[PDB]
Amino acid sequence: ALWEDRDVRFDVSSQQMKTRPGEVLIDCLDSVEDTKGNNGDRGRLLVTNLRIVWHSLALPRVNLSIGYNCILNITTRTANSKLRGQTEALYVLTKCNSTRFEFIFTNLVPGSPRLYTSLIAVHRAYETSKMYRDFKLRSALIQNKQLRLLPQENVYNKINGVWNLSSDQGNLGTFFITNVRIVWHANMNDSFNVSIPYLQIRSVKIRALVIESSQQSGGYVLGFKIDPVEKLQESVKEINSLHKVYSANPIFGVDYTDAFVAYFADGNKQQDREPVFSEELGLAIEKLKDGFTLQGLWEV
Amino acid sequence: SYSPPELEGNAVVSYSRPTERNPDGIPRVSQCKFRLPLKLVCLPGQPSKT
């Protein structure tokens, strides 16, 4: 469903670069040349709400899309002294489904390098806010007896005595309904709580309050049971209404081809062999490559 | 005490043109020369025959 902040795509279409409903553009910069691919071609860089995009600005087909849940390090490099003005450069390190890429972005015209700052800022806002768009078990949600609300979140329905049909004897627990996510704590050792976001929900039906996950947190079917079913169907219908009105415009809580092969961070390596034990060092070491030895790789 | 070699004087401005290629501005220099009067270095005095 949502891939803009979960993958890293190359030669993306002119439509997938367009702002998703919940997405929103923040800052832009022209003439940002792309490097780590020596095409020597200019472009335009965009720091959106969920991902960073770069399109060639002359052949807008060739482009890059990097999600914020797939970046590890972002480094700004101020160099290239007096000969001209102090120009910056952006080094982004990315790891998607165990494959490490690195992209470099060179600001050609030294007259507008401010972009490289705001990105950093929003990236923090992307990581400090993951309870908005991700699924978590047994977190630190509950205060003394109440829920700790996110910034853009207020409770809708406050129901006591809501069971959980995934355990045996620690069930009876409160059920908080909010505009961003729905949570349930256990009211007895209140660290068995589940915080499901509307973004991860696929369909709320009955078989009993069955909630399915959207192929990202796996097929996690959650079952709850309440007092006589009047309030039950009431809660189900209001939950479906809130789900649809959210999916209309997502929130995301962010406050404020061979293309891949030319962007590997390792260098001609998209792999990680099976980590096996090492009797030489005593550490878990990556498997050695068909004849190589540790004391032969170490020396020069 | 000694009189200057010439009364003329120069005045030079060095400025910069901010350009897209070099925002820091390409440096240019232009000058103008003024002419000072004898009334600054001389006075009417007595003449001698030889």
How far is C-alpha A57 from the geometric centre of its chain's CA atoms? Answer: 27
Cβ contacts of A256 within 8 Å, gap of 6 or more: A26, A121, A122, A125
Which residues in chain B are contacts of A31 at CB distance < 8 A? none
Residue type, A231: K
Alpha-carbon A138 to chain mean position: 20
Nearest CA in chain B to A108: B21
Task: Report the distance separating Cα A298 and Cα B9, nearest Å.
Answer: 75
A26-to-A53, A113, A155 alpha-carbon distances in Å: 12, 15, 29
Gap from B31 CA to chain A (nearest CA, Å): 28
Tell me chain A's radius of gyration from C-alpha atoms.
Answer: 24
Q: How many CA atoms lie within 13 A of A49 on its CB side?
A: 16
Q: What are phi and psi of A213, to 5 degrees?
A: -100, 155
Q: Looking at the complex, does the CB of residue B18 fall below 8 Å from at least one CB of chain A?
A: no
**Around Cβ A86, how many Cβ atoms within 10 Å?**
11
Closest-CA residue of chain A to B18:
A111
How many C-beta atoms surround the C-beta of residue B6 within 10 A?
8
Q: What tokens does A215 get? A: 């192929």
Q: Which two tokens stand for residue A147?
A: 């829920």
Task: Locate the DSSP E strands across chain A.
Answer: 8-10, 27-30, 32-35, 44-47, 51-55, 63-67, 71-76, 89-95, 100-107, 136-137, 155-162, 173-178, 181-184, 194-197, 201-205, 210-213, 275-277, 284-286
Q: Is B28 exposed, middle or buried (0-12, 13-18, 19+ CB in 10 A)?
A: exposed
Contact A109 B20 (CB under 8 A): yes
From CA A270, how far away is CA A120, in angstroms rounded?
27
Residue of A nearest to B23 (CA): A111
The CA-atom distances, in angstroms, between A254 and each of A9, A24, A208 are 22, 10, 34
Count helices and strands (H / E) in chain A: 3, 18
Q: How many beta-carbon pairs under 8 angstroms link A with B?
A: 9
CA–CA separation, A99 and A111 (whole Å): 35
| Deposited experimental method | cryo-EM
CB contact under 8 A, B24 and A85: yes
- The Cα–Cα gap between B4 and A294 comes to 85
Distance (Å) from the C-alpha of residue B25 to the closest C-alpha of chain A? 11
Percentages helix, strand, coil for chain B (3-state, rounded to 5) are: 5, 40, 55
Whats the size of chain B, residue-wise?
Answer: 50
Tokens of A275: 């980590």
**Closest alpha carbon within chain A to B22:** A84
DSSP state of B3: P
Shortest Cα distance from B29 to chain A (angstroms)?
21
Interchain CB distance below 8 Å, A110 and B20: no
Q: Any idea where the domains of chain A sit in the sequence?
A: 1-133, 134-248
SS3 A92: strand
Q: Count CB-CB contacts under 10 A for residue A177.
A: 17
Closest Cα to residue A116, out of A94, A92, A100?
Answer: A92
Return the structure tokens found at A125: 């806002």
Inter-CA distances, A49 with A43, A69, A104, B9, Å: 20, 12, 20, 64
List, in sequence order, the alpha helices (H) in chain A. 115-127, 229-248, 294-297
Answer yes or no: do B24 and A109 touch at CB < 8 A.
no
Q: How many residues in total does chain A contain?
A: 300
d(CA A107, nearest CA chain B) in Å: 13
- What the block records as the tokens of B44 is 């009417």
Tell me how far apart the alpha carbons of residues A269 and A289 are, in angstroms, rounded to a whole number. Answer: 13
Whether residue B6 lies within 8 A of chain A, CB to CB, comes out as no
Residue B21 to chain A, least CA–CA distance (Å)? 8
Q: Which residues of B touch A87 (CB under 8 A)?
A: none
For the CA atoms of A263, A265, A268, A272, what is the dihedral angle to 10 degrees?
Answer: -130
Nearest to A112 by CA among A86, A147, A138, A151: A86
* Structure token pair of residue B34: 């003024």
Q: Who contacts A240 (Cβ-Cβ below 8 Å, separation ≥6)?
A: A204
Q: What is the resolution of this structure in A?
A: 3.4
> Is the CB of residue A110 less than 8 Å away from at least one CB of chain B?
yes
Any A CB within 8 A of B23 CB:
yes
Cα distances from B29 to residues B13, B16, B32, in angstroms, run 6, 9, 11
